[PDB]
mmCIF file of C-alpha atoms and ligand atoms in Angstrom:
data_model
loop_
_atom_site.group_PDB
_atom_site.id
_atom_site.type_symbol
_atom_site.label_atom_id
_atom_site.label_comp_id
_atom_site.label_asym_id
_atom_site.label_seq_id
_atom_site.Cartn_x
_atom_site.Cartn_y
_atom_site.Cartn_z
ATOM 1 C CA UNK G 1 -7.703 1.273 -18.033
ATOM 2 C CA UNK G 2 -7.055 -1.579 -19.183
ATOM 3 C CA UNK G 3 -9.412 -3.989 -16.385
ATOM 4 C CA UNK G 4 -7.704 -7.501 -16.556
ATOM 5 C CA UNK G 5 -5.990 -10.237 -14.239
ATOM 6 C CA UNK G 6 -2.659 -11.309 -14.937
ATOM 7 C CA UNK G 7 -1.724 -14.339 -16.291
ATOM 8 C CA UNK G 8 -1.441 -16.119 -12.942
ATOM 9 C CA UNK G 9 -4.318 -14.525 -11.813
ATOM 10 C CA UNK G 10 -4.224 -11.970 -9.754
ATOM 11 C CA UNK G 11 -5.673 -8.923 -9.324
ATOM 12 C CA UNK G 12 -3.605 -6.186 -10.865
ATOM 13 C CA UNK G 13 -6.705 -5.068 -12.778
ATOM 14 C CA UNK G 14 -5.159 -4.510 -16.116
ATOM 15 C CA UNK G 15 -1.655 -3.379 -14.974
ATOM 16 C CA UNK G 16 -1.614 0.198 -15.418
ATOM 17 C CA UNK G 17 -2.753 1.899 -12.708
ATOM 18 C CA UNK G 18 -0.532 4.331 -10.803
ATOM 19 C CA UNK G 19 -2.216 4.715 -7.611
ATOM 20 C CA UNK G 20 -2.279 7.694 -4.927
ATOM 21 C CA UNK G 21 -2.444 7.089 -0.737
ATOM 22 C CA UNK G 22 -5.665 9.517 -1.023
ATOM 23 C CA UNK G 23 -4.386 10.549 3.476
ATOM 24 C CA UNK G 24 -1.544 10.964 5.624
ATOM 25 C CA UNK G 25 -1.254 9.828 9.930
ATOM 26 C CA UNK G 26 -1.835 13.331 11.716
ATOM 27 C CA UNK G 27 -4.913 14.193 8.963
ATOM 28 C CA UNK G 28 -7.568 13.382 11.889
ATOM 29 C CA UNK G 29 -6.126 15.708 13.556
ATOM 30 C CA UNK G 30 -4.619 18.159 11.181
ATOM 31 C CA UNK G 31 -8.504 18.038 9.509
ATOM 32 C CA UNK G 32 -10.935 16.856 11.918
ATOM 33 C CA UNK G 33 -14.164 15.438 10.447
ATOM 34 C CA UNK G 34 -13.137 17.567 6.812
ATOM 35 C CA UNK G 35 -11.962 14.852 5.048
ATOM 36 C CA UNK G 36 -13.307 13.480 2.711
ATOM 37 C CA UNK G 37 -14.876 17.628 1.355
ATOM 38 C CA UNK G 38 -11.391 18.188 1.395
ATOM 39 C CA UNK G 39 -10.610 15.460 -0.924
ATOM 40 C CA UNK G 40 -14.302 15.885 -2.738
ATOM 41 C CA UNK G 41 -12.303 18.999 -3.504
ATOM 42 C CA UNK G 42 -9.032 17.536 -4.831
ATOM 43 C CA UNK G 43 -10.998 14.945 -6.943
ATOM 44 C CA UNK G 44 -10.153 17.046 -10.414
ATOM 45 C CA UNK G 45 -6.860 17.723 -9.519
ATOM 46 C CA UNK G 46 -6.382 14.091 -8.280
ATOM 47 C CA UNK G 47 -7.530 13.133 -11.847
ATOM 48 C CA UNK G 48 -6.191 15.626 -13.976
ATOM 49 C CA UNK G 49 -2.645 15.510 -11.717
ATOM 50 C CA UNK G 50 -2.835 11.446 -14.339
ATOM 51 C CA UNK G 51 -3.366 9.121 -11.281
ATOM 52 C CA UNK G 52 -5.747 6.440 -11.780
ATOM 53 C CA UNK G 53 -6.796 4.829 -8.365
ATOM 54 C CA UNK G 54 -6.651 6.401 -4.618
ATOM 55 C CA UNK G 55 -6.071 4.948 -1.904
ATOM 56 C CA UNK G 56 -8.072 5.936 0.504
ATOM 57 C CA UNK G 57 -8.183 6.219 4.842
ATOM 58 C CA UNK G 58 -10.234 2.696 6.946
ATOM 59 C CA UNK G 59 -14.154 3.430 6.748
ATOM 60 C CA UNK G 60 -14.581 1.783 9.821
ATOM 61 C CA UNK G 61 -15.064 4.603 12.946
ATOM 62 C CA UNK G 62 -12.303 4.812 15.241
ATOM 63 C CA UNK G 63 -12.613 6.665 18.115
ATOM 64 C CA UNK G 64 -9.798 5.194 19.569
ATOM 65 C CA UNK G 65 -6.972 7.329 21.920
ATOM 66 C CA UNK G 66 -3.224 6.395 23.770
ATOM 67 C CA UNK G 67 -1.008 8.572 25.656
ATOM 68 C CA UNK G 68 1.104 8.085 29.022
ATOM 69 C CA UNK G 69 4.434 10.607 27.744
ATOM 70 C CA UNK G 70 3.856 12.982 25.150
ATOM 71 C CA UNK G 71 3.488 10.969 22.328
ATOM 72 C CA UNK G 72 -0.362 10.766 21.241
ATOM 73 C CA UNK G 73 -2.631 8.440 18.692
ATOM 74 C CA UNK G 74 -6.392 7.058 17.900
ATOM 75 C CA UNK G 75 -9.110 7.163 15.358
ATOM 76 C CA UNK G 76 -7.516 6.937 12.102
ATOM 77 C CA UNK G 77 -9.308 3.590 11.410
ATOM 78 C CA UNK G 78 -6.788 0.816 12.264
ATOM 79 C CA UNK G 79 -8.256 0.232 15.400
ATOM 80 C CA UNK G 80 -12.035 0.770 14.404
ATOM 81 C CA UNK G 81 -14.750 -0.457 16.527
ATOM 82 C CA UNK G 82 -17.985 -0.657 14.547
ATOM 83 C CA UNK G 83 -18.603 -0.918 10.263
ATOM 84 C CA UNK G 84 -20.352 3.186 10.926
ATOM 85 C CA UNK G 85 -18.987 5.337 8.202
ATOM 86 C CA UNK G 86 -19.118 8.587 10.514
ATOM 87 C CA UNK G 87 -16.329 10.341 12.236
ATOM 88 C CA UNK G 88 -12.866 10.903 12.717
ATOM 89 C CA UNK G 89 -12.445 11.369 8.516
ATOM 90 C CA UNK G 90 -15.772 13.202 8.008
ATOM 91 C CA UNK G 91 -19.750 11.245 8.030
ATOM 92 C CA UNK G 92 -21.029 8.609 6.043
ATOM 93 C CA UNK G 93 -22.912 11.555 3.335
ATOM 94 C CA UNK G 94 -19.478 13.161 2.900
ATOM 95 C CA UNK G 95 -18.077 9.578 2.452
ATOM 96 C CA UNK G 96 -20.652 8.946 0.035
ATOM 97 C CA UNK G 97 -20.082 12.883 -1.880
ATOM 98 C CA UNK G 98 -16.374 12.091 -1.669
ATOM 99 C CA UNK G 99 -16.507 8.901 -3.726
ATOM 100 C CA UNK G 100 -18.907 9.452 -6.033
ATOM 101 C CA UNK G 101 -16.653 12.335 -7.270
ATOM 102 C CA UNK G 102 -13.266 10.988 -7.146
ATOM 103 C CA UNK G 103 -15.000 8.183 -8.896
ATOM 104 C CA UNK G 104 -16.964 10.742 -11.080
ATOM 105 C CA UNK G 105 -13.548 12.417 -11.959
ATOM 106 C CA UNK G 106 -12.759 8.344 -13.275
ATOM 107 C CA UNK G 107 -10.135 7.785 -10.493
ATOM 108 C CA UNK G 108 -10.848 4.209 -8.596
ATOM 109 C CA UNK G 109 -11.342 4.259 -4.909
ATOM 110 C CA UNK G 110 -10.034 1.276 -3.250
ATOM 111 C CA UNK G 111 -10.767 1.728 0.843
ATOM 112 C CA UNK G 112 -8.883 0.543 3.446
ATOM 113 C CA UNK G 113 -9.371 -2.371 4.876
ATOM 114 C CA UNK G 114 -7.964 -3.987 8.535
ATOM 115 C CA UNK G 115 -9.701 -7.453 9.348
ATOM 116 C CA UNK G 116 -7.074 -8.988 11.612
ATOM 117 C CA UNK G 117 -9.439 -6.902 14.607
ATOM 118 C CA UNK G 118 -10.939 -4.645 16.301
ATOM 119 C CA UNK G 119 -11.075 -1.917 19.154
ATOM 120 C CA UNK G 120 -13.086 -4.838 21.471
ATOM 121 C CA UNK G 121 -13.047 -2.933 24.753
ATOM 122 C CA UNK G 122 -14.933 -0.318 22.950
ATOM 123 C CA UNK G 123 -18.105 1.066 25.226
ATOM 124 C CA UNK G 124 -20.997 2.450 22.077
ATOM 125 C CA UNK G 125 -20.480 0.230 19.255
ATOM 126 C CA UNK G 126 -22.653 -1.972 16.702
ATOM 127 C CA UNK G 127 -20.662 -4.793 16.228
ATOM 128 C CA UNK G 128 -20.566 -7.406 20.164
ATOM 129 C CA UNK G 129 -18.666 -10.400 19.628
ATOM 130 C CA UNK G 130 -18.826 -12.558 22.701
ATOM 131 C CA UNK G 131 -16.305 -14.695 24.249
ATOM 132 C CA UNK G 132 -16.344 -18.279 24.081
ATOM 133 C CA UNK G 133 -18.291 -19.198 20.708
ATOM 134 C CA UNK G 134 -14.767 -18.734 19.121
ATOM 135 C CA UNK G 135 -15.463 -15.360 17.335
ATOM 136 C CA UNK G 136 -11.705 -14.541 18.680
ATOM 137 C CA UNK G 137 -8.016 -15.617 19.273
ATOM 138 C CA UNK G 138 -7.888 -15.054 22.914
ATOM 139 C CA UNK G 139 -10.657 -18.137 23.014
ATOM 140 C CA UNK G 140 -7.893 -20.537 22.454
ATOM 141 C CA UNK G 141 -4.685 -20.434 24.238
ATOM 142 C CA UNK G 142 -2.091 -18.321 22.944
ATOM 143 C CA UNK G 143 1.398 -19.340 23.352
ATOM 144 C CA UNK G 144 3.319 -16.685 21.178
ATOM 145 C CA UNK G 145 2.855 -14.647 18.546
ATOM 146 C CA UNK G 146 1.962 -17.506 16.021
ATOM 147 C CA UNK G 147 -1.553 -19.014 15.236
ATOM 148 C CA UNK G 148 -3.575 -20.654 17.714
ATOM 149 C CA UNK G 149 -6.433 -22.801 16.600
ATOM 150 C CA UNK G 150 -8.559 -19.648 16.835
ATOM 151 C CA UNK G 151 -6.657 -17.253 14.357
ATOM 152 C CA UNK G 152 -4.375 -18.598 11.466
ATOM 153 C CA UNK G 153 -1.943 -15.691 11.926
ATOM 154 C CA UNK G 154 -0.148 -13.814 13.876
ATOM 155 C CA UNK G 155 -1.622 -11.007 16.167
ATOM 156 C CA UNK G 156 -2.003 -7.567 17.037
ATOM 157 C CA UNK G 157 -0.154 -6.445 19.576
ATOM 158 C CA UNK G 158 -1.112 -8.454 22.347
ATOM 159 C CA UNK G 159 -3.756 -10.423 20.778
ATOM 160 C CA UNK G 160 -6.764 -9.821 22.764
ATOM 161 C CA UNK G 161 -8.191 -7.763 20.302
ATOM 162 C CA UNK G 162 -7.656 -10.684 17.569
ATOM 163 C CA UNK G 163 -10.589 -12.095 15.374
ATOM 164 C CA UNK G 164 -10.986 -15.242 14.098
ATOM 165 C CA UNK G 165 -11.254 -14.253 10.713
ATOM 166 C CA UNK G 166 -11.516 -18.141 9.916
ATOM 167 C CA UNK G 167 -14.932 -17.927 11.595
ATOM 168 C CA UNK G 168 -17.241 -18.796 9.289
ATOM 169 C CA UNK G 169 -19.779 -15.712 10.752
ATOM 170 C CA UNK G 170 -16.698 -13.929 10.974
ATOM 171 C CA UNK G 171 -15.506 -14.249 7.754
ATOM 172 C CA UNK G 172 -19.180 -13.321 6.276
ATOM 173 C CA UNK G 173 -19.434 -10.055 8.662
ATOM 174 C CA UNK G 174 -16.269 -8.996 6.496
ATOM 175 C CA UNK G 175 -17.348 -10.695 3.148
ATOM 176 C CA UNK G 176 -20.979 -8.382 3.979
ATOM 177 C CA UNK G 177 -19.188 -5.556 3.877
ATOM 178 C CA UNK G 178 -17.144 -5.749 1.517
ATOM 179 C CA UNK G 179 -19.756 -6.051 -1.005
ATOM 180 C CA UNK G 180 -21.283 -2.857 0.984
ATOM 181 C CA UNK G 181 -18.183 -0.766 0.555
ATOM 182 C CA UNK G 182 -18.679 -2.133 -3.435
ATOM 183 C CA UNK G 183 -21.926 -1.149 -3.652
ATOM 184 C CA UNK G 184 -22.858 1.827 -1.998
ATOM 185 C CA UNK G 185 -19.326 3.745 -1.633
ATOM 186 C CA UNK G 186 -17.926 3.228 -5.100
ATOM 187 C CA UNK G 187 -15.090 0.801 -3.663
ATOM 188 C CA UNK G 188 -13.382 -0.373 -7.265
ATOM 189 C CA UNK G 189 -10.883 -2.341 -4.596
ATOM 190 C CA UNK G 190 -9.365 -3.268 -1.605
ATOM 191 C CA UNK G 191 -5.925 -1.979 0.072
ATOM 192 C CA UNK G 192 -5.094 -4.942 3.589
ATOM 193 C CA UNK G 193 -4.099 -4.368 6.250
ATOM 194 C CA UNK G 194 -1.694 -6.533 8.600
ATOM 195 C CA UNK G 195 -1.922 -9.739 6.161
ATOM 196 C CA UNK G 196 0.416 -11.548 8.191
ATOM 197 C CA UNK G 197 -1.901 -11.701 10.931
ATOM 198 C CA UNK G 198 -4.363 -13.644 9.206
ATOM 199 C CA UNK G 199 -4.012 -16.355 6.023
ATOM 200 C CA UNK G 200 -3.766 -15.021 2.645
ATOM 201 C CA UNK G 201 -6.165 -17.806 0.695
ATOM 202 C CA UNK G 202 -8.959 -16.237 2.621
ATOM 203 C CA UNK G 203 -8.137 -12.911 1.186
ATOM 204 C CA UNK G 204 -8.696 -14.863 -2.108
ATOM 205 C CA UNK G 205 -12.107 -15.292 -1.144
ATOM 206 C CA UNK G 206 -13.095 -12.794 0.295
ATOM 207 C CA UNK G 207 -11.792 -11.137 -3.638
ATOM 208 C CA UNK G 208 -13.801 -14.146 -5.536
ATOM 209 C CA UNK G 209 -16.846 -13.676 -3.223
ATOM 210 C CA UNK G 210 -17.186 -10.064 -3.137
ATOM 211 C CA UNK G 211 -15.764 -8.183 -6.114
ATOM 212 C CA UNK G 212 -13.487 -10.419 -8.071
ATOM 213 C CA UNK G 213 -12.228 -8.434 -11.134
ATOM 214 C CA UNK G 214 -11.713 -4.784 -8.835
ATOM 215 C CA UNK G 215 -7.746 -4.513 -7.202
ATOM 216 C CA UNK G 216 -6.356 -5.895 -5.060
ATOM 217 C CA UNK G 217 -2.596 -4.817 -2.554
ATOM 218 C CA UNK G 218 -2.144 -6.183 0.752
ATOM 219 C CA UNK G 219 0.371 -4.920 3.045
ATOM 220 C CA UNK G 220 3.603 -8.506 4.001
ATOM 221 C CA UNK G 221 5.593 -6.417 6.189
ATOM 222 C CA UNK G 222 7.514 -9.359 7.711
ATOM 223 C CA UNK G 223 11.779 -9.963 7.519
ATOM 224 C CA UNK G 224 12.726 -13.399 7.506
ATOM 225 C CA UNK G 225 14.362 -12.878 11.129
ATOM 226 C CA UNK G 226 10.600 -12.889 12.014
ATOM 227 C CA UNK G 227 9.590 -16.883 10.970
ATOM 228 C CA UNK G 228 10.476 -19.510 13.144
ATOM 229 C CA UNK G 229 14.190 -21.035 12.016
ATOM 230 C CA UNK G 230 12.874 -24.109 10.905
ATOM 231 C CA UNK G 231 10.618 -21.750 8.142
ATOM 232 C CA UNK G 232 11.642 -22.042 4.265
ATOM 233 C CA UNK G 233 11.096 -17.558 4.875
ATOM 234 C CA UNK G 234 13.868 -17.076 7.626
ATOM 235 C CA UNK G 235 16.571 -17.676 4.841
ATOM 236 C CA UNK G 236 14.516 -16.261 1.553
ATOM 237 C CA UNK G 237 14.735 -12.920 0.528
ATOM 238 C CA UNK G 238 12.345 -10.331 1.125
ATOM 239 C CA UNK G 239 11.133 -10.884 -2.263
ATOM 240 C CA UNK G 240 10.419 -14.675 -1.857
ATOM 241 C CA UNK G 241 8.671 -13.726 1.294
ATOM 242 C CA UNK G 242 6.361 -11.592 -0.580
ATOM 243 C CA UNK G 243 5.682 -12.655 -4.390
ATOM 244 C CA UNK G 244 4.878 -16.436 -1.944
ATOM 245 C CA UNK G 245 1.896 -13.817 -0.180
ATOM 246 C CA UNK G 246 0.960 -12.625 -4.047
ATOM 247 C CA UNK G 247 0.949 -16.494 -5.401
ATOM 248 C CA UNK G 248 -1.943 -17.508 -2.162
ATOM 249 C CA UNK G 249 -3.479 -14.338 -2.159
ATOM 250 C CA UNK G 250 -3.763 -13.351 -5.899
ATOM 251 C CA UNK G 251 -3.702 -9.599 -5.078
ATOM 252 C CA UNK G 252 0.059 -7.593 -6.055
ATOM 253 C CA UNK G 253 1.433 -6.799 -2.346
ATOM 254 C CA UNK G 254 3.898 -3.531 -1.622
ATOM 255 C CA UNK G 255 6.528 -4.089 -2.491
ATOM 256 C CA UNK G 256 8.777 -4.173 0.875
ATOM 257 C CA UNK G 257 11.799 -5.780 -0.448
ATOM 258 C CA UNK G 258 12.684 -2.206 -2.946
ATOM 259 C CA UNK G 259 11.600 -0.201 0.463
ATOM 260 C CA UNK G 260 14.338 -2.453 2.817
ATOM 261 C CA UNK G 261 16.820 -1.776 -0.407
ATOM 262 C CA UNK G 262 15.929 1.766 -0.652
ATOM 263 C CA UNK G 263 16.292 2.666 3.228
ATOM 264 C CA UNK G 264 19.673 -0.263 4.103
ATOM 265 C CA UNK G 265 21.242 -0.548 0.318
ATOM 266 C CA UNK G 266 22.684 1.794 -2.262
ATOM 267 C CA UNK G 267 20.830 3.309 -5.126
ATOM 268 C CA UNK G 268 22.612 0.609 -7.059
ATOM 269 C CA UNK G 269 20.714 -2.228 -5.301
ATOM 270 C CA UNK G 270 17.752 -0.826 -5.845
ATOM 271 C CA UNK G 271 17.211 -3.100 -8.074
ATOM 272 C CA UNK G 272 16.220 -6.073 -5.886
ATOM 273 C CA UNK G 273 13.720 -4.553 -5.082
ATOM 274 C CA UNK G 274 10.320 -7.398 -6.308
ATOM 275 C CA UNK G 275 9.631 -4.684 -9.194
ATOM 276 C CA UNK G 276 13.292 -5.166 -10.719
ATOM 277 C CA UNK G 277 12.574 -8.995 -11.350
ATOM 278 C CA UNK G 278 13.600 -10.317 -14.528
ATOM 279 C CA UNK G 279 10.971 -12.930 -14.275
ATOM 280 C CA UNK G 280 7.350 -10.678 -15.924
ATOM 281 C CA UNK G 281 5.288 -13.185 -13.265
ATOM 282 C CA UNK G 282 7.048 -11.387 -10.359
ATOM 283 C CA UNK G 283 7.984 -8.197 -10.974
ATOM 284 C CA UNK G 284 4.164 -7.543 -12.159
ATOM 285 C CA UNK G 285 2.890 -8.411 -8.717
ATOM 286 C CA UNK G 286 5.364 -5.388 -6.341
ATOM 287 C CA UNK G 287 3.846 -1.817 -5.872
ATOM 288 C CA UNK G 288 6.129 -0.010 -5.401
ATOM 289 C CA UNK G 289 5.886 3.235 -3.305
ATOM 290 C CA UNK G 290 8.680 5.401 -1.664
ATOM 291 C CA UNK G 291 6.699 6.088 2.153
ATOM 292 C CA UNK G 292 3.064 5.290 3.516
ATOM 293 C CA UNK G 293 1.698 6.449 6.840
ATOM 294 C CA UNK G 294 3.552 4.426 8.423
ATOM 295 C CA UNK G 295 7.131 3.874 7.111
ATOM 296 C CA UNK G 296 7.107 8.072 6.282
ATOM 297 C CA UNK G 297 6.230 11.444 8.040
ATOM 298 C CA UNK G 298 3.281 12.959 8.176
ATOM 299 C CA UNK G 299 2.090 16.509 8.163
ATOM 300 C CA UNK G 300 1.676 18.265 11.923
ATOM 301 C CA UNK G 301 1.825 16.042 15.114
ATOM 302 C CA UNK G 302 5.565 14.788 15.796
ATOM 303 C CA UNK G 303 6.320 14.202 12.268
ATOM 304 C CA UNK G 304 3.717 11.008 12.479
ATOM 305 C CA UNK G 305 5.005 7.763 12.265
ATOM 306 C CA UNK G 306 8.166 7.708 10.706
ATOM 307 C CA UNK G 307 8.642 4.144 11.511
ATOM 308 C CA UNK G 308 11.377 2.936 7.584
ATOM 309 C CA UNK G 309 11.453 6.992 6.220
ATOM 310 C CA UNK G 310 13.935 7.883 3.472
ATOM 311 C CA UNK G 311 16.057 10.316 3.863
ATOM 312 C CA UNK G 312 14.833 13.387 2.444
ATOM 313 C CA UNK G 313 18.215 14.005 -0.151
ATOM 314 C CA UNK G 314 16.516 10.441 -1.844
ATOM 315 C CA UNK G 315 12.245 11.477 -2.107
ATOM 316 C CA UNK G 316 13.139 12.718 -5.921
ATOM 317 C CA UNK G 317 15.539 9.538 -6.668
ATOM 318 C CA UNK G 318 12.948 7.603 -5.439
ATOM 319 C CA UNK G 319 9.500 8.462 -7.598
ATOM 320 C CA UNK G 320 11.965 9.072 -10.613
ATOM 321 C CA UNK G 321 12.848 4.994 -9.937
ATOM 322 C CA UNK G 322 9.023 4.575 -8.585
ATOM 323 C CA UNK G 323 7.516 5.858 -11.763
ATOM 324 C CA UNK G 324 9.458 4.949 -14.860
ATOM 325 C CA UNK G 325 10.158 1.086 -13.544
ATOM 326 C CA UNK G 326 7.733 -2.146 -13.526
ATOM 327 C CA UNK G 327 5.302 -2.698 -10.358
ATOM 328 C CA UNK G 328 2.531 -0.274 -9.885
ATOM 329 C CA UNK G 329 3.714 3.349 -8.114
ATOM 330 C CA UNK G 330 1.580 4.507 -4.933
ATOM 331 C CA UNK G 331 2.490 8.346 -4.520
ATOM 332 C CA UNK G 332 2.092 9.357 -0.632
ATOM 333 C CA UNK G 333 0.565 12.453 -0.651
ATOM 334 C CA UNK G 334 2.388 14.500 1.211
ATOM 335 C CA UNK G 335 5.321 14.124 -1.009
ATOM 336 C CA UNK G 336 2.400 15.374 -3.224
ATOM 337 C CA UNK G 337 0.616 18.150 -1.734
ATOM 338 C CA UNK G 338 2.059 18.719 1.327
ATOM 339 C CA UNK G 339 6.627 18.958 0.700
ATOM 340 C CA UNK G 340 6.684 20.476 -2.990
ATOM 341 C CA UNK G 341 7.641 17.560 -5.075
ATOM 342 C CA UNK G 342 3.896 17.497 -6.677
ATOM 343 C CA UNK G 343 5.453 19.592 -10.463
ATOM 344 C CA UNK G 344 8.188 16.713 -10.549
ATOM 345 C CA UNK G 345 5.935 13.887 -9.964
ATOM 346 C CA UNK G 346 3.585 15.615 -12.227
ATOM 347 C CA UNK G 347 5.735 15.223 -14.632
ATOM 348 C CA UNK G 348 6.994 11.281 -14.334
ATOM 349 C CA UNK G 349 3.511 9.882 -14.740
ATOM 350 C CA UNK G 350 3.444 11.965 -17.609
ATOM 351 C CA UNK G 351 6.344 10.231 -18.852
ATOM 352 C CA UNK G 352 5.184 6.939 -17.204
ATOM 353 C CA UNK G 353 2.278 7.422 -19.435
ATOM 354 C CA UNK G 354 4.249 8.029 -22.807
ATOM 355 C CA UNK G 355 6.079 5.252 -22.991
ATOM 356 C CA UNK G 356 3.611 2.832 -22.236
ATOM 357 C CA UNK G 357 5.498 1.831 -18.755
ATOM 358 C CA UNK G 358 3.055 -1.130 -17.376
ATOM 359 C CA UNK G 359 3.759 -3.502 -14.577
ATOM 360 C CA UNK G 360 5.147 -6.415 -16.579
ATOM 361 C CA UNK G 361 7.151 -3.864 -18.921
ATOM 362 C CA UNK G 362 10.717 -5.002 -19.067
ATOM 363 C CA UNK G 363 13.558 -3.184 -17.412
ATOM 364 C CA UNK G 364 17.519 -4.026 -17.411
ATOM 365 C CA UNK G 365 20.128 -2.830 -15.050
ATOM 366 C CA UNK G 366 23.497 -1.868 -16.483
ATOM 367 C CA UNK G 367 26.635 -2.254 -14.798
ATOM 368 C CA UNK G 368 29.716 -0.647 -16.246
ATOM 369 C CA UNK G 369 28.330 3.416 -14.520
ATOM 370 C CA UNK G 370 27.830 4.370 -11.321
ATOM 371 C CA UNK G 371 24.469 4.886 -9.529
ATOM 372 C CA UNK G 372 21.508 2.925 -10.833
ATOM 373 C CA UNK G 373 21.081 3.544 -14.532
ATOM 374 C CA UNK G 374 18.250 0.935 -15.841
ATOM 375 C CA UNK G 375 17.094 0.677 -19.746
ATOM 376 C CA UNK G 376 12.843 0.281 -19.186
ATOM 377 C CA UNK G 377 11.414 -1.623 -21.957
ATOM 378 C CA UNK G 378 7.990 1.201 -22.713
ATOM 379 C CA UNK G 379 5.310 -0.191 -24.754
ATOM 380 C CA UNK G 380 5.668 2.742 -26.871
ATOM 381 C CA UNK G 381 8.688 4.575 -25.791
ATOM 382 C CA UNK G 382 12.501 3.171 -24.619
ATOM 383 C CA UNK G 383 13.575 4.851 -21.115
ATOM 384 C CA UNK G 384 17.215 5.349 -19.958
ATOM 385 C CA UNK G 385 16.753 6.370 -16.448
ATOM 386 C CA UNK G 386 19.984 7.561 -14.305
ATOM 387 C CA UNK G 387 19.898 8.005 -10.989
ATOM 388 C CA UNK G 388 23.269 9.857 -9.168
ATOM 389 C CA UNK G 389 25.293 8.180 -12.137
ATOM 390 C CA UNK G 390 27.858 9.284 -14.198
ATOM 391 C CA UNK G 391 26.451 8.047 -17.463
ATOM 392 C CA UNK G 392 27.189 10.338 -20.360
ATOM 393 C CA UNK G 393 24.638 9.997 -22.386
ATOM 394 C CA UNK G 394 21.674 7.423 -22.876
ATOM 395 C CA UNK G 395 23.744 6.083 -26.007
ATOM 396 C CA UNK G 396 26.464 4.606 -24.044
ATOM 397 C CA UNK G 397 23.755 1.733 -22.857
ATOM 398 C CA UNK G 398 21.142 2.016 -25.054
ATOM 399 C CA UNK G 399 20.235 1.512 -29.881
ATOM 400 C CA UNK G 400 18.279 4.658 -30.311
ATOM 401 C CA UNK G 401 17.596 8.350 -30.949
ATOM 402 C CA UNK G 402 17.430 9.672 -27.898
ATOM 403 C CA UNK G 403 15.745 13.551 -25.595
ATOM 404 C CA UNK G 404 15.795 14.511 -22.435
ATOM 405 C CA UNK G 405 12.775 13.567 -20.436
ATOM 406 C CA UNK G 406 13.867 14.499 -16.868
ATOM 407 C CA UNK G 407 17.002 16.524 -15.807
ATOM 408 C CA UNK G 408 16.514 16.866 -11.692
ATOM 409 C CA UNK G 409 19.198 17.812 -8.771
ATOM 410 C CA UNK G 410 21.785 18.968 -10.580
ATOM 411 C CA UNK G 411 22.056 15.858 -12.870
ATOM 412 C CA UNK G 412 21.377 13.237 -10.786
ATOM 413 C CA UNK G 413 18.392 12.687 -12.065
ATOM 414 C CA UNK G 414 17.956 11.921 -15.971
ATOM 415 C CA UNK G 415 15.159 10.176 -17.714
ATOM 416 C CA UNK G 416 15.240 10.108 -21.085
ATOM 417 C CA UNK G 417 13.438 9.225 -24.368
ATOM 418 C CA UNK G 418 10.604 11.852 -24.409
HETATM 419 CA CA1 CA Y 501 -6.574 -0.751 -15.034
HETATM 420 CA CA1 CA Y 502 -4.544 -12.640 13.628
#
């Protein structure tokens, strides 16, 4: 657990984390109020499985609800009303035991933080920010889902719940809460939600003031077509958009360029995500995932959100590639503990660890076979990865003595050098 910043000063924490997304969308529904006890009970497992960090759900209490026609939601944390740590996932006391047990087993706790907005109209809540005082986005003219004088980022839905995160007083509030999470809830890092809602520069602000040396990740989900026509990003690549954000916030960023290639291109096009980047400075800030709570399915209620879910026929291949490649991989809870991909994912974590693959290890792609075939230069071992390809032996693409590390789904997943 080497914990340092990247050459460009990005908060990647050594570049050797292996993160577990600690929850799915329907937990509040499936294990109402018992979520932190379940995690306290699994901390030992999570640690033994190889994770270095865990991404916790929003700690700020959410008692929102929404219906209209069979299909509901609420209380997951993205529409919180207070910094109180009560209900939905568990009590403040179970949170403390959860974090104390996780941290005690060597797993960092990363908190999901939601600064863009809050449940403004919730009755019984501890934070009350009046209108006309400049605390809210809507205190200014709001022409459209574009920055106004009261919010230097996009808005959430209508934008009636958007805070002016730039207001000294709204800024200091979040800053205090972050420090709080760190001194009393053992936070080891933060996962910023909806990063397009407020300046990236503010995220660096928050990290410098509260946990300068911790791990951070931002989720920027905004494609080129969502930027104005005159903006340079309207014609850039997904990777450029994502890297610019990282350059300014000084935090790694979820690799939405690889997610977009997993969803829209071929396995061969997977080399086009941030983590395939021939530049170490580019590749090393990527946070690769296969699915999260938004993009994927969740057990229970209506399959969850599944906004951009990867087909089950590519799950094994997706994990085999983020677990063996550069960037910092995230494993989805359900894949891991619900759906039975666990043993396969345990094998890969071991292989990543044994070859000493890290954020910045080099990777080269091999042109002449079908599927994706890559040579990943681990700091201890070289890996040869052949996904859905015709590659016959590792020696056809790399010099050296090789051993079968993984061999799954009728040869569709093959990884060599132990
Ligand atoms: Ca580390
Ligand atoms: Ca905003």
